[PDB]
Symmetry: C3
Subunit: 264 residues, 3 copies
């Protein structure tokens, strides 16, 4: 803490401010700027030309590419320099020009990214976002403020997710989409505004979901989208299904967090 | 002029060419490049890794973030190094990777941005554009050449405005739009190609327009879009309305500048 | 080879690794990074803040702007550091934040860009892409992996081309498009997903195609899109037409490479 490990490498052209913590076998490349409240974990690499600032904690074995901006002042017009936070986990691939901004006081104070994510060129994570584990944001994918992207979700290229929206686990959002409402777990969404196109079967298969689990999830999707019933009508029905198929509880948990209605 | 104020701060790693003017309490951060024909006003901050060049005048209390390119050679295939210009006013927040390019001789020689604007990540202002005051360009918003964005207008994320188009004052263009024709003042536009969706009532309310003014503006919108008359038929009618409600004159002034027809 | 020409200029702040080849009257600007397996041809300019790495060959009289990343590790999840390649030809204008990534072993090992191209701000050329000569990628235009863009083709702003797709010569793809299938030569495409809108007549006229050639190309387009016949039905017919009008052979050559079907 507030120490640069003797096995970390800091390029002579880099500027790491006194107070920064840099772990064993980390690598700060040329022309990087690292502020005094940053913590960079073991084995993390900033290739070159990376700016990291604010109250920002980055885990182990991350790879952050040139022209990325991590921890920076957010774009919220109300933000006025309060000491809000960014947390990033482990083994993320954070590509050229990615931006990850600090929270706002009003939004909870924290922008959080988990582990094993791929954030492709110019992906944007606004203030107060929460990204889980094993997600993909393709090139130019943009999360406006207060967005949640749950585990394994893919946000396609050139896609915007509007403020406060929740993207459930194992979702796939097609490229060139505008997501203006909440996307239930396990769903394929595409378009502007994005609408649902069935369950992400190929994803669930690849990720080892059982036959029974995928059938149950398709049954939950049909309750929401095909039954023609109200969401409040089908909530008990989905809970009843989840009593046998635990993967269906993700719908229940998602309904509790959803504030924008569902894409339809 | 051609002087660096004794109260300006220039990082030792920055490269400011002889001839540049830098005002009192300006701050040029690490790895910035500032060319010889640049003028930077009092209190302006280039955070780090900013390139400013060409015949470029930047006002007071701007905040320009890393990886921005301001004044650079434009993308017009006819441009051949002529000494065209950029002018930027005061109190702008110009975020990471924004690009603002110099004019072309054929297009009038000047790209101009006013004051109190927010240009979000990777917004683009092409050659010969004119942006007013208190505008917002959201992430990846792109103005192709010779575009005007009038005061208070918001261009949503991932939106392109095609060359020569005029966006009137207090417009809101939705995210993921393609604007291929002119947008009258006070209008909501969305889609690809963008089409009108009524007056920006919430914006006008927030910005202190009177009840009478907003009703008059809605009446002007109905003349254009609902009356089913020709634009040339309803111009006198809108001028007549403006004789009582001065805010309606913005329509008249806009018609005189519009060359691409109106979105419909 | 492995030599810096005595007439090349390397800024003192640049970092060019031992083994890099830099030709006569090349210019490496401030804060550039050039790796040991890079070759930069005569007269090429890296303005500032450019990263060039990997097994990468860049020709003569290129202009590469700040915050570009050329030769970098690609975004393919299977790629694991294999010594794949980028080749770039001559007289390209490669604008701010452009990304051009190295190949994958599985995709053929090479990303290739020809000559006299304009790659506008934040254009992206993924692993295993092939871009010809005199192409334009407008701002934020994105080629996903294994895409071909043939000579004179224009990819509009904010447009994504999905993996493996082929864009034929003299195509124009409109801004804000998603191209999910193959685009025949000489065709205008727009939308999400992009659909065809006739032949690019204005382009062909500007580029000196004969009257007879343009009529023949329109006749080939009608066979594909208007005749209501199968593609396999009209292939002989298009070959027969090409026996008189050589420009129609581009259709034949294109059919042989197309794997995703045609946009329709
Ligand atoms: C109809 N098909 C689509 O929409 C495909 N797709 C969604 C998508 C995206 C990525 C994945 N990955 C799976 N493993 C790793 N990545 C899967 C699905 C797009 O985003 C296309 S555009 C694009 C695509 C890639 C890069 C840049 C751009 Cl611009
Ligand atoms: C249907 N609603 C929309 O389209 C919302 N919107 C327009 C818009 C945009 C901004 C404002 N601001 C108002 N005060 C400050 N900013 C208002 C309306 C988008 O651009 C969404 S996408 C996006 C949004 C924000 C950042 C990045 C991205 Cl990508
Ligand atoms: C319906 N018309 C369109 O879609 C126009 N267009 C296609 C296009 C694009 C470029 C050319 N060039 C021809 N010589 C040089 N460039 C021609 C056609 C767009 O890409 C518009 S958006 C945009 C446009 C330009 C820059 C940034 C953005 Cl974002
Ligand atoms: Na809820
Ligand atoms: Na006019
Ligand atoms: Na084929």
């Amino acid at each position: 803490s507030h120490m640069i490990d003797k096995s970390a490498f800091v390029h002579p052209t880099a500027i790491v401010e006194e107070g920064a913590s840099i772990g064993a076998n980390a690598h700060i490349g040329p022309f990087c700027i690292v502020g005094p409240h940053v913590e960079i974990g073991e084995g993390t690499v900033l290739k070159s030309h990376v700016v990291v600032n604010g109250h920002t904690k980055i885990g182990r074995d991350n790879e952050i590419y040139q022209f990325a901006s991590i921890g920076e002042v957010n774009q919220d017009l109300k933000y006025a320099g309060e000491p809000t936070r960014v947390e990033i986990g482990d083994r993320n691939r954070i590509r050229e020009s990615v931006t990850i901004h600090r929270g706002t006081v009003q939004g909870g104070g924290l922008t959080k990214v988990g582990s094993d994510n791929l954030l492709m060129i110019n992906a944007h994570i606004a203030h107060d976002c929460t990204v889980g584990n094993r997600c993909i944001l393709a090139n130019n994918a943009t999360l406006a403020g207060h967005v949640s992207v749950d585990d394994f979700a893919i946000i396609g290229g050139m896609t915007a997710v509007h403020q406060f929206c929740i993207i459930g686990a194992h979702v796939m959002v097609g490229g060139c989409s505008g997501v203006a409402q909440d996307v239930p777990p396990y769903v394929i969404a595409q378009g502007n505004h994005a609408t649902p196109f069935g369950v992400n079967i190929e994803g669930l298969k690849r990720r080892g979901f059982s036959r029974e689990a995928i059938t149950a999830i398709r049954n939950a999707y049909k309750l929401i989208y095909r039954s023609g019933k109200t969401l409040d009508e089908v909530k008990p029905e989905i809970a009843e299904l989840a009593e046998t198929y635990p993967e269906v509880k993700a719908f229940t948990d998602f309904f509790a967090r959803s504030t924008r209605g569902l894409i339809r």
